[PDB]
C-alpha cells in the first residue's frame, strides 16, 4: 500500500493523528501523510475524516491544499497531501523582527480570499482559519489547509457545531452563541490573520471567552497599513455578520488593485 512512500520526518500531530513528510520512491514527489487510526471495534471512521476527505475531494483550487490520494488499509487511513514548505505562523515567527513586505501581505491575503470564496461558492465553511492551518511554498503561493473542522452548509444555514474555530480567531456571533452562523465567521478569521501578517502578533489574544469579547469590544466599539488596507480590515471585522464584507466582495476591494505575486524570504 505504502511501500512506495519513504518517511522523511514528523511535521505535526493532533487527535487527527501524526503528520509525516514523505517521498514517493518512484516519482520523487514529496508529500505530507496524515495517518488516521481507525477504531474498527468501536467508532469506525471518525466524522472529522469523513468530512475532511469528502470535502477536499470536491474542492480543486490553486489556493486549497491538494488531497492527492487516500490509502484504505483495514486498520489505518493514510491521507496523501501535497507538501508545502511551511505554515504562515512559522513564517510570521521567523519574520517577527524583519517584518513581512506589504506586497507579500497583499498577495497572501488576495490568495486566501480566492481560496475561501471558492469554499463559500461551494457550500463549505472551513471554521478553523488560523496561521497554523495556512501553508506557503517557496514560490509565493499560500493555501487553505486542515479541513478537519469544515462543514458542508445548506441555504439557509441551520444550527451547526458551536465548538468551532480556535479562540483567538473566533467571530463574535460564535462567542455569544447566536443560534445561527455563516460564511461571515470565516471572513472574521481572515480579518484577524490580515492584521496578524502586518504586526506579526495576534490581534485578539484572549485568555478566555470573556477576555476575547472584551478585546474585540475595546478595539471595535494596525500602524503600517495604508488607508485602503485599514478600510478592508474594518469591513472584514464588522461586528454585524450581515454587514461583514464577503470574500467575493473583498476580492474587488481597491486594496488589491495593484496586487502582484512575490516570492518570500525563506
Amino acid at each position: 500500500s505504502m511501500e512506495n512512500f519513504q518517511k522523511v520526518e514528523k511535521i505535526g500531530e493532533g487527535t487527527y493523528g501524526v503528520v509525516y513528510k514523505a517521498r514517493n520512491k518512484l516519482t520523487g514527489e514529496v508529500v505530507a501523510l496524515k495517518k488516521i487510526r481507525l477504531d474498527t471495534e468501536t467508532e469506525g471512521v471518525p466524522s472529522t475524516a469523513i468530512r475532511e476527505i469528502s470535502l477536499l475531494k470536491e474542492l480543486n483550487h490553486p489556493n486549497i491544499v491538494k488531497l492527492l490520494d487516500v490509502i484504505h488499509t483495514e486498520n489505518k487511513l493514510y491521507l496523501v497531501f501535497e507538501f508545502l514548505h511551511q505554515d504562515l505562523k512559522k513564517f510570521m515567527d521567523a519574520s517577527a523582527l524583519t517584518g513581512i513586505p506589504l506586497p507579500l501581505i497583499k498577495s497572501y491575503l488576495f490568495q486566501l480570499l480566492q481560496g475561501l470564496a471558492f469554499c463559500h461558492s461551494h457550500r463549505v465553511l472551513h471554521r478553523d482559519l488560523k496561521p497554523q492551518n495556512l501553508l506557503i511554498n517557496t514560490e509565493g503561493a499560500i493555501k487553505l489547509a486542515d479541513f478537519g473542522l469544515a462543514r458542508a452548509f445548506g441555504v439557509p444555514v441551520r444550527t451547526y457545531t458551536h465548538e468551532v474555530v480556535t479562540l483567538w480567531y473566533r467571530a463574535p456571533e460564535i462567542l455569544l452563541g447566536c443560534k445561527y452562523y455563516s460564511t461571515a465567521v470565516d471572513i472574521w478569521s481572515l480579518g484577524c490573520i490580515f492584521a496578524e501578517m502586518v504586526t506579526r502578533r495576534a490581534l485578539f489574544p484572549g485568555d478566555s471567552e470573556i477576555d476575547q469579547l472584551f478585546r474585540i469590544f475595546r478595539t471595535l466599539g494596525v500602524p503600517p497599513l495604508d488607508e485602503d488596507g485599514r478600510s478592508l480590515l474594518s469591513q472584514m471585522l464588522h461586528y454585524d455578520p450581515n454587514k461583514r464584507i464577503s470574500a467575493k466582495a473583498a476580492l474587488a476591494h481597491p486594496f488589491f488593485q495593484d496586487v502582484t505575486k512575490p516570492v518570500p524570504h525563506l
Partner: protein
Amino acid sequence: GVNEVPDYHEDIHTYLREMEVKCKPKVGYMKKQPDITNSMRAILVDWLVEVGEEYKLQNETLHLAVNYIDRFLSSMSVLRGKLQLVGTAAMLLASKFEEIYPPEVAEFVYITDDTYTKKQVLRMEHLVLKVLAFDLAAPTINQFLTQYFLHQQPANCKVESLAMFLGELSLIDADPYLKYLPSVIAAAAFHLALYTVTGQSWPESLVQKTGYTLETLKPCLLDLHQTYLRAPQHAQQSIREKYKNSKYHGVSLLNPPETLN
C-alpha cells in the same frame, strides 16, 4: 441576512445542479439486483424514517442515507439478508456527515435488533466509503426545498411541512422517483404543497432561478399527485405517522386536492 448567503446563493444553486447529475444513482438498478426488489427498498427507507424519528435526526440526514443506499446498490449486488446492513451503515455515515451529535455505533446496532454485530456495521461502513469513493456531499431534495422556501411571501409553516412531507414520500418509491433529479422532485413538492394550502402555484421568482415551469415539472407532479393521493393505502406508513405530529403542524392529515391543471 448573511444566513441566506446573498453573495453565494446562486453560485451554490448552480453547483448543486451539476452535482445532482453526477451523484445520481442508476435508474432501474433494481432490475439488475437478482435478490432484492423495489418493495424491499421501500421497507428499508420507511424504517430509516422511523430511525430518524426515534433519534431526532435531521431530515437532511435521512435524504443523504437514501442517496448513499441507491448509489451503493447501483454498483454492488446485495443479498436480501444484507440489505438492512447496507442501510444501517448508510444512516451511520450520513449521521457522521450531517449531525452535530450523531448517535454512537452501538445505537445503530441496537435498532437492527441484534441482526448484525457491531463489527459488521463498522466493516460495512468502510465498504460503503470505498464504493462511494468518499463522495458523501450529495445534493438532496431537502437542500433544494430549503432554498425554494426563501421565495415565499409570506412564509407559511404549513406549506414548508407539507413540502418536506411530499419530498420524503418520494424516497420510499424507487419506481418512479429514481428517474427524477432531486431539484425536479423538490419543485414538484413545493408547488403541490402551496396549491394544497394556499391555492397559489409555482412562483415566478423560482422559474427564473431554476428554468423549471409547470410545463417541465408536469410528469413529476403527476406521479407525486398520485403518490399523495394513495399515501393512506401504501404499505409504508412511517412518513404519514411522522407528519401527524405538531412538530410538522399535522399536514399529513390534510386532504390532497382532487385536481391541478
